[PDB]
Design a protein around this motif. Structure first.
Motif, mmCIF file in Angstrom:
data_model
loop_
_atom_site.group_PDB
_atom_site.id
_atom_site.type_symbol
_atom_site.label_atom_id
_atom_site.label_comp_id
_atom_site.label_asym_id
_atom_site.label_seq_id
_atom_site.Cartn_x
_atom_site.Cartn_y
_atom_site.Cartn_z
ATOM 1 N N UNK B 55 0.848 -1.205 0.000
ATOM 2 C CA UNK B 55 0.000 0.000 0.000
ATOM 3 C C UNK B 55 0.877 1.247 0.000
ATOM 4 N N UNK B 56 2.037 1.162 0.667
ATOM 5 C CA UNK B 56 3.031 2.248 0.644
ATOM 6 C C UNK B 56 3.726 2.245 -0.715
ATOM 7 N N UNK B 57 3.632 3.356 -1.428
ATOM 8 C CA UNK B 57 4.303 3.468 -2.717
ATOM 9 C C UNK B 57 5.841 3.313 -2.567
ATOM 10 N N UNK B 86 4.222 8.949 -9.682
ATOM 11 C CA UNK B 86 4.471 10.370 -9.667
ATOM 12 C C UNK B 86 3.762 11.047 -10.821
ATOM 13 N N UNK B 129 2.196 15.794 -6.696
ATOM 14 C CA UNK B 129 2.508 14.695 -7.610
ATOM 15 C C UNK B 129 2.427 13.301 -6.990
ATOM 16 N N UNK B 130 2.477 13.233 -5.663
ATOM 17 C CA UNK B 130 2.403 11.977 -4.924
ATOM 18 C C UNK B 130 1.136 11.979 -4.100
ATOM 19 N N UNK B 132 -2.628 9.296 -3.266
ATOM 20 C CA UNK B 132 -3.671 8.437 -3.806
ATOM 21 C C UNK B 132 -4.944 8.733 -3.017
ATOM 22 N N UNK B 133 -6.057 8.121 -3.418
ATOM 23 C CA UNK B 133 -7.337 8.214 -2.686
ATOM 24 C C UNK B 133 -7.896 9.635 -2.535
ATOM 25 N N UNK B 134 -7.445 10.542 -3.395
ATOM 26 C CA UNK B 134 -7.948 11.907 -3.417
ATOM 27 C C UNK B 134 -7.237 12.813 -2.423
ATOM 28 N N UNK B 135 -6.246 12.273 -1.710
ATOM 29 C CA UNK B 135 -5.553 12.994 -0.636
ATOM 30 C C UNK B 135 -4.851 14.251 -1.182
ATOM 31 N N UNK B 136 -5.217 15.394 -0.603
ATOM 32 C CA UNK B 136 -4.710 16.742 -0.974
ATOM 33 C C UNK B 136 -5.048 17.234 -2.377
ATOM 34 N N UNK B 137 -6.001 16.593 -3.043
ATOM 35 C CA UNK B 137 -6.501 17.087 -4.333
ATOM 36 C C UNK B 137 -7.510 18.176 -3.960
ATOM 37 N N UNK B 252 -2.000 4.327 -12.064
ATOM 38 C CA UNK B 252 -1.580 3.854 -10.746
ATOM 39 C C UNK B 252 -0.887 2.515 -10.839
ATOM 40 N N UNK B 254 -0.103 0.208 -8.229
ATOM 41 C CA UNK B 254 -0.592 -0.891 -7.373
ATOM 42 C C UNK B 254 -2.124 -0.796 -7.326
#
Ligand code: ADP
Ligand code: ADP
Ligand code: ADP
Ligand code: ADP
Ligand code: GLU
Ligand code: GLU
Ligand code: GLU
Ligand code: GLU
Ligand code: MG
Ligand code: MG
Ligand code: MG
Ligand code: MG
Ligand code: ZN
Ligand code: ZN
Ligand code: ZN
Ligand code: ZN
Lengths: 56, 281, 282, 56, 281, 281
Positions: B55-57, B86, B129-130, B132-137, B252, B254
């Motif tokens: 889960x960790x990129x 990225x 640039x890094x 997932x899951x909409x985080x900080x969009x 993506x 993973x």
């Protein structure tokens, strides 16, 4: 199922036969827990917090 | 063939992949890289193929790199993880090849970000640039919102989070499109429908899957995109622009696929294991 | 030819490169990417070559990617920056091709780090994959030091800093070797001598430069390492192992060269500009 | 050389003719400052602090 | 009398204090706590009074505490620095005594912050309990902005930054009021006018000074707030509220005062040195 | 009498306090401050006493502050949480009163930390003012280790973690002493024995409990320390020093007491509920 002790509250946690080591389970105390293998035992420890690099 | 399944948190996807390995009679081990260290030596070379599922990129990236150093073929490869992980690197590859992407400006400081808002006007999307899951969009609709977002990003502990992708906002349908490709071939697509009180379509945020018709233009857009980045098992996020049509938003490395399965009824884990068996046996 | 020099903080190195562009009659602009945003479009295609000089590795990586998307040839390329800026990715490529690297184990959690120490024993070096100037490169000589370092890494805000490269400690000469290559050819090498109260050789930490004889094995090592990673203007750090000889420790994608210059008397900025004119004139 | 005001302590800063925009200068007040261009003017702003990704 | 002036970065304020010490024939030393460590012993007891002026909150708090351990009277005291440095602690003391504050709801998790937004409605102000110069003071206009703000703050490295102070947005005079008190006596007040493209009054953010006349109600509010926190040399930020009148927004324990001096032509440093000479010789 | 029990994550300690409240027929509510926001208003005044038990120090601090604003007596108070939660603030109060503490130097920058190591010599203990369970308490053996520790802490996201407490390393009995006080009276003490491969005694780190007899000197030191900080329900950590005798290392304002119960068979929750019933009814 198997009955494991919560590493946070010492309550009883019912872990399904479905569970594999590395799966996450939520307990009623508010803790998020991860199942892991300790020799011949399944056990529970505190799950990691979401990282800034987590996801797809 | 010996396969290693590399994991940190075991989600339903990892469980389904392990089940598919079992049911197709593939010999496999699971290594949990949140628990076991990985040596730079030839020991891991006992595996023919690694399926990279942390889960960790950064865990996916580094576990892939160590396995590759031992001559294990990894799915996905460290090069693909680095690029798809990225968004700036992904956009660079796609843009160079003429794949449509949202109209984007990159700002690498607070000063530069405010200038980019001023150049572009509102509304806009600002995302790092890094993630997932909409985080900080973030949806930026005026200068007050933009100024406060700038301040918040400046306090992030990963300096890559301080890089701003400032983009046109593309949404008029209430959804985005998620596709999966295996072996650079389209597996299927579905729609993620934006829920009430959201601007983001992610299933992780309440996005609801539904099926769509996949026309030739959609298929060709996806296939071309995946081909450019060389992903072996990747997901692709597509936005629909009212004038420009399909625009590639991200890939993506993973992919999760719980939502994909509810929409398409495609057994993704089975399809993956069949591909691996056919190509690496 | 039109060159763009991409900077955030202007050090001596950037000044010297600007001066060498000027002195060799090369048309160039400077864009400060800590000040100006960069668009993904064809506008920056007005430049033939970009010399990527930000001190921030992420700024170097991303400015290079945006310029490449406009069809500008960047030195170094984003693919080189990504790989050389990450020690695990560098060791992967080097190891695979038979370049000697320190014996290393990767640990991606506190739990895994402790296992790594236990597998290897002491002393060891534990450093993260990202960083420069010796930052967080830790000498671990017993379990107490090991445990406290693990705890400290867990509180870093960049999750890549939580990845541990646990490796053999290689030092018996009181220095390491720094080389520079341009166009995958060796430019020169020198020794960075470790100062009192340090375990690290970095010039940024007080490392003092001195010259060395460059023998064939050293040249061959550097050239092969640089060819594997495909850097056009890179530095290489080498350690000297009492039994194994030269071991490649890392490569760097935005090299500093003030120390190199005092030791070798090489005009690095002039050699770079010459190389660019030689290979990219239009 | 030019005399510029410190944005931290309001005191006088003697910036060399060498100076390019983007160069760092320390001041006696303890501040690290960066040279920048504001139209026809050289000026000084607080410098950035070292990031975890800074270096070669 | 011997004075010690405690600094880290010497701003114009610290230089003006050092100058006033010199001109009023006060014997004084400077200790830079970004350079020198401070032992817990009886050495520092040679000083009668310490003027605590580091720019860093932690440095001010801990230098004060070490000097107090040695029996030095510090201006301000470590308990004043702790309370004034934290908006929740300040609001708690003020509210208990009946001093008007903005209507506030404290949220101590992401889940509780979203509930608080739902309770208050939009627009609202969400700020953390620590910070200066308007930092992370956000005007939240809708749930989209609220959600992104919660997400950003969850990812910060200081747990105090995860505490949300959810407040009514006070919009009345387009300014706030900045006062200084020395020895719990009001030195004076001025107005900081909000500039274009701002919602915040801070001079640091382009706020421009102007003068106001201090009426009896303003004086009483300021002096009563200062005495509640026992602040010896503090600034007070006041917002004008259409129904509540003067509400106290915050107190500052290491006040900046160049704006104050421009606005009022009051020699703050001189008044501070005179006060110390008057009360501690 | 109405009690509110303030929680976030319900550990055994909180379950035992809840159980004691019901077994003793005390009217009580539970508020989970990880779930619910708390307004600054008079509504919380319905409670006579609050027992502050969140695991997060900031949640404890701020939940206490909001309740006190409403006129609720909190155990512990916000002032106590602030001081006991911070090692430097604690040491300052104890040292001023002549209560022995480990010999300590405070360093508030990387430069000052290196100077402090040079003043102390090696070995030494370096720890931040904030933290529990032994986190970042480092045994520094030489300048190499010191320099790496300085570098790490400089890269942390809470500025309190950049303050170094540089102390004499006390090595005498291979244990520390843990006491509990209620109403500023000593409940009891036990010993935490340092396990193999540790330098720290915390039960959380493998510390093993044993019993000690409390002599008058120990009791006096503990009661004096608790009285100075005004702690109503606190733990006290004491180190035995070969020359100084009992030294106070720290106080904890939300004490865990599972090890205490096992070691002493004292029903801590029961005594606490008896105390509250006896004093707040
Ligand atoms: N430029 C854009 N225009 C419109 N919506 C966007 C844009 N960028 C992102 N989004 C929305 O936000 C969601 C998440 O953003 P995305 O770029 O996919 O990042 P992540 O990797 O976090 O999923 C998308 O599914 C989409 O709904
Ligand atoms: N495995 C090692 N053995 C001995 N010394 C090392 C080792 N790794 C790093 N060092 C020392 O630490 C210094 C910095 O490490 P390096 O890996 O070059 O990281 P950076 O990118 O921070 O310079 C080196 O110059 C060398 O002196
Ligand atoms: N509740 C509020 N309503 C209206 N404006 C506010 C409110 N809170 C803060 N502000 C504005 O933001 C500015 C900075 O906020 P403040 O709470 O004083 O934080 P800081 O300590 O960062 O100065 C204030 O001067 C005021 O202009
Ligand atoms: N100065 C010291 N000398 C010896 N041991 C110490 C010292 N400081 C702390 N320790 C050890 O480390 C353990 C944890 O340190 P402590 O200061 O109590 O921090 P925490 O608040 O994290 O428990 C203590 O139980 C003690 O065993
Ligand atoms: N990470 C994807 C998963 C989608 C899926 O399950 O198909 C999302 O949150 O949208
Ligand atoms: N970053 C290198 C620079 C060496 C040089 O200036 O040659 C170091 O600190 O060692
Ligand atoms: N920090 C205050 C200073 C005001 C003053 O200098 O008086 C502000 O930015 O508004
Ligand atoms: N946090 C304490 C708990 C002691 C106890 O439960 O009594 C420790 O780890 O030692
Ligand atoms: Mg997406
Ligand atoms: Mg190096
Ligand atoms: Mg203010
Ligand atoms: Mg302790
Ligand atoms: Zn539990
Ligand atoms: Zn994504
Ligand atoms: Zn390096
Ligand atoms: Zn200055």
């Amino acid at each position: 199922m198997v009955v494991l002790k919560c590493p946070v509250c010492n309550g009883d946690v019912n872990v399904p036969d479905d569970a594999l080591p590395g799966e996450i389970v939520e307990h009623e105390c508010g803790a998020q827990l991860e199942v892991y293998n300790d020799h011949g035992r399944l056990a529970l420890r505190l799950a990691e917090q979401v990282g800034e690099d987590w996801g797809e | 063939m010996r396969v290693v399944l590399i994991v940190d948190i075991v989600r339903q996807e990892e469980k389904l992949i392990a089940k598919a390995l079992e049911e197709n009679k593939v010999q496999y081990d699971i290594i949990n890289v949140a628990q076991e260290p990985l040596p730079f030596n030839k020991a891991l070379g006992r595996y023919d193929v690694a399926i990279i599922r942390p889960v960790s990129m950064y865990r996916a990236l580094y576990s892939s790199a160590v396995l590759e150093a031992a001559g294990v073929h990894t799915i996905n490869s460290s090069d693909v993880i680095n690029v798809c992980g990225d968004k700036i690197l992904t956009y660079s590859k796609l843009y160079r090849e003429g794949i449509p992407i949202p109209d984007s400006i990159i700002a690498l400081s607070a000063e530069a970000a405010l200038k980019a808002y001023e150049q572009r006007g509102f509304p806009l999307i600002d995302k790092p640039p890094i993630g997932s899951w909409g985080r900080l969009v973030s949806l930026i609709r005026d200068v007050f919102e933009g100024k406060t977002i700038i301040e918040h990003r400046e306090l992030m502990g990963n300096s890559a989070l301080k890089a701003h992708i400032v983009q046109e906002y593309i949404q008029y349908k209430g959804r985005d499109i998620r596709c999966i490709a295996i072996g650079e071939e389209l597996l299927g697509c579905y729609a993620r429908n934006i829920p009430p009180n959201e601007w983001r379509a992610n299933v992780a945020l309440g996005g609801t899957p539904s099926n769509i018709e996949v026309d030739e233009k959609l298929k060709e857009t996806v296939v071309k995109a995946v081909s450019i980045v060389h992903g072996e098992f990747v997901s692709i996020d597509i936005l629909e622009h009212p004038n420009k049509g399909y625009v590639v938003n991200e890939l993506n490395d993973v992919p999760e696929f719980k939502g994909f399965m509810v929409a398409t009824n495609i057994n993704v884990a089975q399809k993956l294991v069949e591909y691996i068996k056919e190509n690496y046996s």
